[PDB]
Design a protein around this nucleic acid. Structure first.
Length: 71
DNA sequence: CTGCCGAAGCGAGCACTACTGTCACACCTATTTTAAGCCCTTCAATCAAATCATCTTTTGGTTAGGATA
């Protein structure tokens, strides 16, 4: 279930640890790197942009702290 | 017309280190020779702290490997 990555590393059998396995998976996890879009992400992105943006300047990536699976 | 002697307030003795006239002998330095240790300067050889140049780790945006909504 993408959980207990110590067990995942042990099952891998190449002497990897949980942290390395998780790092590699997250760097190649479609669920994390959101090529997709969701309604709540769009709504909250619009809300934060409208709250903060002045003129043509918006906090393009500082919104990522609030919305998951982004950069 | 001059002169004696009282009343009250004072007082005593007991309770089983600054100068000056001399004076000779100290102070003082003329140099020799070591043997290991001296203080300060003064520059030179070596060092290490800080700064610059460039490779690289990651933080916002564009590209065409890559994808949903």
């Amino acid at each position: 279930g993408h959980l207990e990555w110590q067990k995942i590393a042990e099952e891998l059998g190449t002497s990897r640890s949980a942290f390395q396995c998780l790092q590699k998976f997250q760097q190649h996890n479609k669920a994390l790197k959101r090529k997709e879009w969701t309604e709540e992400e769009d709504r909250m992105l619009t809300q934060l942009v409208q709250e903060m943006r002045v003129g043509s300047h918006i906090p393009y990536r500082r919104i990522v702290y609030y919305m998951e699976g982004r950069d």
